[PDB]
């Protein structure tokens, strides 16, 4: 009762098992005193007691979970770490009851905010996949990794058996495909999430879990297998998966330099040679414009949509894979998952019908059995296609080379055609670059730095951070001076289109020009569009419009349009 | 009664957050200030999601315990001056109001109630109708209008705060040797400062901030705002003041100064306001006027 053990007295487990030793009153009181003495006293090398600084922020966020690193608990009072690894279900009860004392020392009457606090363990120093688990692991703490395959809804559950409840949710976890050995199927396990941990993860995420490994009787398993076979589950204890002023100043430094637009385009898709216009269009789509709306009868999207007609083997699928790794959020082939992101299509009636609705709208609506509901698309579409068989025909307009309705070609902001042209010098350049890249990739720090800096003019980590910063912070606008010239150019282009008997230029093209100019302003972190932005946007759209036409019309257009496609 | 902005309407959290005194005491224009407020409510034992509930519907127990909770906690934040006594009125079953809340409702109705000479005329005429929109709210039979006044007061303080943070974070205050100068060249909507009263409210915000930010240099301040229709700056001259808790009064000297530069100057200017501390001047003439002003010994 009154007397307490020394820490050295705990070195000898005196009962027949760990659990029956931890649960004794004098041992338990000793452990409680020692844990409280650790939590009030552990330090950085700089002093600066971390847990006194964490409890402080627990109340600043009105939170419920205190987080403890295992390495700190192993760095002093090692026996408590050993007992925690062996008997988590007991040790964590004592530790939670100590954590409440420590928090009330900062914030008296915190019990009125939350009645009970949970300790979360981090950095447990050994890991298993779902292969290595065996019966010896039962009731031990484990650390596991995988992909979350399926998730239930959240429900309340009765806490005690006057009443009290807690939140509950189950998650199915599967081995990551990179970990699975060759020629074997992946394994599965199911995880239980309680009060603070529900909806911490989403289906398809790759996730890391710490918790107790636990089992129970199940009648159906016994009945079907015909042997006394128990079922097992994991009870999670913790689950795992911005910028400074220095980054902002660095971004602004590079943006202040001349030619930053060209350098960003050059950094785009380093492994692919040539095809600068495709890289330009992809960069413009990833940065995008600004959305606008006028409740008097009109709305304008900020997203930029691009379509690429590809000869066989002209790098299309590689740049889509590159964009998939570059972009913040994306879908590859579902438009709900592409919300405020980029959507990627590499090959191609109901699918096309869905895309017809998606290009007309920015939000999707559906009804079924009298139910009615709505969803958001709000995304930029990058698509590629094979031109109606083995090879494109340049003598014909674009419609002859595609399996698309006319409004698709109207509503795509940018159209482009890529062809396997014949040139000895280009072939030699391609072949030299290809074998050079092949050698540079061979499995057989300084080597990496040289390789990286030869690969690109911008480090791509900085470029991804820069794209995210620009997308979240920069919102450009037009300047009202040069817009008279834009209107005159629009009228001139329409007059020339009619004069040669071309299909006419339209308001959609003018809108696309303004949107692309906004994107060009965003690329250099400029809140103003400028004359050169309008010039570049005009060149892109005019050249794209010219590429869609028949050959005789193409010659008349380029002869007249020289003062836009090349001059300004 | 508490020097908290409209306590018995909106919520307890908003009462602290928009208080003109609290902003000077805890520096709410930045996150290192806002976190102090979260920290306070956590120590006081009030769950933060209840502090944001509408004060009428907030739980009865907190309502009656609040008077003791403040005695135990405001000292640790240097914030004891919040406590004071005031007058409260109630009529039948429709609930209490204090005089401090009433005058903010009145003022709000004054401010926002609903070539160059004609536009000036139209504006000046619109401001007179609000007199009667205020007048008719002094009657217990017309509480409906008073509630509208309160709804307008909240939006006015919101818009003021969202301009004050921009002034401080971009460091637009220019620290001249004799006085402090600030000029608003642009804003989210700069029209709200075209009325004198609103301009005075913004000045009153900045003055508390300047009074508490350093112990040194109690200085006069000048505040100005441009108008795109007149191309004229509306100018106000503001005194310092001593903190609440601390002995002759000081005197506003801008009157004589403005008068003398007006008597001397080439500049195109206006002086017709009852409060002589407020003037108007055309766009190009602001800098020579202020140059002659700072060159003068009358400051």
């Amino acid at each position: 009762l009154r007397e307490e053990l020394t820490l050295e007295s705990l070195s000898n487990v005196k009962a027949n098992s760990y659990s029956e030793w931890i649960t004794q009153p004098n041992v338990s009181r000793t452990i409680a005193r020692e844990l409280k003495s650790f939590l009030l006293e552990y330090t950085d090398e700089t002093g600066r007691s971390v847990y006194g600084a964490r409890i402080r922020t627990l109340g600043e966020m009105n939170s419920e979970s205190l987080e403890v690193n295992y390495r700190h608990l192993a760095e002093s009072k090692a026996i408590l770490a050993l007992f925690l690894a062996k008997c988590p279900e007991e040790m964590l009860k004592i530790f939670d009851l100590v954590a409440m004392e420590a928090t009330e020392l900062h914030y008296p009457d915190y019990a009125r905010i939350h009645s009970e606090i949970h300790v979360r363990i981090s950095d447990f120093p050994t890991i298993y996949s779902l292969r290595e688990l065996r019966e010896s692991n039962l009731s031990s703490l484990v650390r596991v990794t995988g992909v979350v395959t399926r998730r239930t809804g959240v429900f309340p559950q009765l806490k005690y058996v006057k009443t009290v409840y807690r939140n509950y949710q189950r998650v199915t976890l599967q081995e990551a495909p990179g970990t699975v050995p060759p020629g074997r199927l992946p394994r599965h396990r199911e995880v239980i999430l309680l009060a603070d941990l529900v909806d911490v993860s989403k289906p398809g995420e790759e996730v890391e879990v710490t918790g107790i490994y636990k089992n129970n009787y199940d009648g159906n398993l016994n009945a079907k297998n015909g042997f006394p076979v128990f079922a097992t589950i994991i009870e999670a204890n913790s689950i795992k998966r911005s910028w400074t002023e220095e980054e902002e100043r660095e971004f602004r430094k590079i943006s202040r330099d001349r030619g930053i637009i060209d350098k960003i385009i050059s950094s785009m898709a380093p492994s692919i040679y040539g095809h600068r216009d495709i890289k330009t269009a992809v960069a413009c789509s990833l940065f995008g414009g600004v959305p606008k709306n006028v409740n008097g009868k009109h709305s304008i999207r900020g997203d930029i949509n691009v379509l690429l007609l590809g000869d066989p083997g002209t790098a299309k699928s590689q740049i889509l894979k590159y964009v998939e790794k570059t972009a913040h959020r994306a879908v590859f082939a579902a438009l709900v998952l592409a919300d405020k992101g980029v959507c990627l299509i590499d090959e191609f009636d109901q699918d096309r019908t869905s895309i017809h609705e998606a290009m007309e709208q920015q939000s999707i609506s559906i009804s079924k059995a009298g139910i009615v509901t709505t969803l958001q698309a709000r995304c930029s579409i990058i698509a590629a296609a094979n031109p109606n068989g083995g090879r494109y025909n340049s003598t014909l307009p674009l419609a002859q080379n595609v399996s698309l309705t006319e409004p698709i070609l109207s509503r795509f902001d940018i159209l482009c055609v890529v062809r396997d042209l014949v040139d000895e010098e280009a072939d030699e350049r391609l072949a030299t670059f290809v074998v050079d890249s092949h050698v540079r990739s061979h499995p057989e720090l300084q080597r990496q730095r040289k390789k990286e800096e030869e690969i690109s003019p911008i480090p791509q980590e900085l470029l991804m951070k820069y794209i995210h910063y620009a997308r979240t912070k920069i919102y450009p606008k037009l300047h009202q001076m040069d817009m008279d010239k834009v209107s005159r150019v629009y009228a001139d282009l329409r007059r020339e289109s009619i004069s040669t008997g071309s299909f006419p230029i339209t308001v959609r093209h003018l809108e696309s020009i303004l949107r692309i100019a906004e994107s060009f302003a965003k690329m250099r972190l400029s809140e103003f569009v400028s004359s050169y932005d309008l010039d570049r946007a005009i060149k892109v759209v005019v050249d794209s419009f010219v590429d869609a036409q028949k050959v005789s019309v193409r010659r008349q257009l380029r002869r007249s349009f020289a003062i836009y496609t090349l001059g300004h | 009664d508490y020097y908290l902005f409209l306590l018995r309407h909106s919520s307890l959290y908003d009462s602290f957050y928009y208080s003109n005194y609290v902003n000077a005491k805890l520096s709410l224009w930045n996150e290192n200030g806002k976190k102090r407020l979260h920290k306070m409510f956590a120590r006081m034992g009030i769950p933060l999601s209840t502090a944001q509930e509408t004060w009428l519907y907030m739980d009865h127990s907190i309502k009656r315990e609040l008077g003791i909770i403040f005695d135990k906690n405001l000292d640790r934040y240097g914030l004891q001056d919040i406590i004071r006594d005031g007058f409260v009125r109630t009529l039948g079953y429709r609930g209490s109001i204090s005089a401090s809340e009433f005058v903010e409702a009145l003022t709000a109705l004054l401010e926002v109630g609903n070539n160059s000479a004609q536009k000036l005329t139209n504006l000046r005429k619109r401001w007179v109708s609000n007199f009667w929109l205020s007048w008719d709210a002094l009657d217990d039979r017309k509480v409906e209008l008073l509630n509208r006044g309160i709804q307008l007061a909240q939006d006015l303080q919101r818009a003021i705060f969202n301009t004050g943070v921009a002034i401080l974070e971009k460091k637009l205050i220019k620290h001249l040797r004799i006085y402090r100068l600030c000029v608003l060249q642009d804003g989210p909507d700069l029209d709200l400062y075209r009325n004198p009263l609103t301009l005075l409210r913004l000045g009153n915000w900045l003055i508390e901030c300047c009074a508490e930010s350093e112990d040194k240099q109690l200085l006069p301040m000048v505040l100005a705002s441009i108008d795109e229709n007149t191309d004229t700056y509306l100018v106000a001259g503001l005194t310092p003041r001593y903190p609440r808790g601390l002995k002759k009064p000081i005197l506003n000297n801008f009157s004589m100064a403005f008068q003398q530069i007006t008597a001397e100057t080439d500049a195109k200017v206006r002086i017709d306001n009852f409060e002589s501390s407020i003037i108007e001047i055309r766009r190009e003439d602001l800098s020579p006027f202020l140059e002659k002003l700072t060159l003068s010994g009358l400051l």
Partner: peptide
């Protein structure tokens, strides 16, 4: 107690700052 002073210092810095 001197060893636990760093904890109480982190608590008191809320008073100071």
């Amino acid at each position: 107690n001197p060893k636990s002073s760093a904890f109480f210092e982190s608590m008191v810095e809320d008073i100071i700052e």
